[PDB]
């Protein structure tokens, strides 16, 4: 699935009062049991990067964000190979789990999908 589709569907749910009332609490529990925060990851660190679109989005990250992401990946890799969890300041707090990459990939995909549409335009 494209990030675009995920974001759009999520926004439909957040709009609906009833839907959000059921989904938001479930999503928050899911994220707690997912346990990526216990390796010091942000959610966006987990997104598959081996696509043209995502490589382009990563290149557009501000240098600081980019350097910090590299460190989080290396740190998580070290926790993984040691079979340890993050402790203290290494644990990602909910307020630190920011969607730093989502705006970049949404722009990359917006252009890519517009290009696909316009490649199929028919002069009326």
């Amino acid at each position: 699935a494209s990030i675009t589709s995920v974001v759009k569907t999520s926004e439909l749910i957040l709009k609906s009062p009833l839907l959000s009332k059921i989904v938001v609490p479930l999503a928050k529990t899911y994220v707690k049991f997912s346990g990526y925060r216990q390796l010091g990851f942000k959610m966006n660190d987990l997104i598959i990067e081996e696509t043209p679109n995502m490589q382009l989005a990563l290149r557009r990250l501000p240098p600081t964000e980019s350097y910090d992401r590299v460190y989080r990946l290396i740190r998580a890799t070290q926790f993984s190979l040691s079979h340890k969890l993050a402790t203290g300041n290494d644990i990602t707090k909910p307020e630190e789990d920011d969607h730093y990459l989502i705006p970049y990939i949404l722009d990359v995909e917006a252009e890519a999908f517009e290009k696909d549409a316009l490649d199929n335009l028919e002069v009326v």
């Binding site: 350097y67 460190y71 290396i74 740190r75 070290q78 190979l81 040691s82």
Partner: protein, 244 residues
């Protein structure tokens, strides 16, 4: 399927060879050969066993040569191309009671007694099945069982009706080592002998396995030390990050 259609499952008997470190009891193998020779060999072949196979397992070279030399085997034709017989040699296979299947079935009311060389591997249960079958003929079939003609009731046999009658009775064999030849004793001995016949490498295999287990275990332990030794710089790695 009904339990009857499967056959009763044999008990697990404590065979001397049960046990990772245990050989066959060779005195039991020798006695079991004698049961084979005096009882089973009337109807059953042991075609995969040669006289040489007994040597240094159950018999000396001389005893086995004596068994072979008592028999006649087909020789190569003479100079006029006429058939000839010769005395047996250690290389010869133990001869069966029948020339072909048809003769075997004619002597056994249509049933074919199987070759016993692999029978311990060819039946679920192995030695336990052989022992249970030979000792498991009740005097009377359970009320309601209808046996087909020439069939005998034996609960261990699938379906219950076997073409082989009970053959082991107290004192049908006189053992040469003075052991009392009860039904149970003879069944145990012959089951051991047939287990050996199916897997003659058994004793050597388990001893080599002991050696392998020891070497491989030690190598496993050492490989753990060496892996941990080599990996410790990676496991012990520490980082200090100063965001640029």
């Amino acid at each position: 399927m009904t339990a009857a259609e499967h056959g009763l499952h044999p008990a697990e008997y404590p065979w001397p060879q049960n046990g990772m470190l245990s050989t066959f009891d060779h005195a039991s193998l020798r006695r079991g050969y004698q049961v084979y020779k005096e009882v089973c060999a009337a109807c059953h072949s042991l075609d995969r066993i040669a006289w040489r196979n007994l040597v240094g397992v159950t018999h000396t070279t001389d005893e086995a040569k004596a068994f072979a030399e008592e028999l006649e085997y087909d020789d190569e034709p003479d100079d006029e191309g006429n058939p000839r017989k010769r005395p047996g040699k250690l290389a010869d296979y133990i001869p069966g009671p029948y020339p072909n299947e048809q003769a075997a079935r004619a002597a056994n009311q249509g049933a074919l007694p199987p070759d016993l060389s692999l029978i311990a591997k060819a039946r679920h249960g192995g030695a336990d099945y052989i022992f249970a079958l030979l000792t498991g003929y009740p005097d009377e079939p359970p009320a309601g069982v209808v046996l087909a003609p020439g069939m005998n009731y034996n609960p261990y046999f699938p379906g219950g009706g076997i073409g082989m009658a009970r053959t082991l009775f107290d004192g049908v064999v006189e053992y040469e080592d003075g052991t009392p030849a009860t039904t149970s004793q003879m069944a145990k001995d012959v089951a051991a002998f047939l287990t050996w016949a199916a897997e003659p490498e058994h004793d050597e295999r388990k001893k080599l396995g002991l050696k392998a287990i020891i070497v491989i275990s030690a190598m496993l332990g050492l490989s753990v030390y060496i892996k941990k030794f080599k990996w410790s710089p990676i496991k012990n790695r520490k980082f200090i990050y100063n965001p640029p």
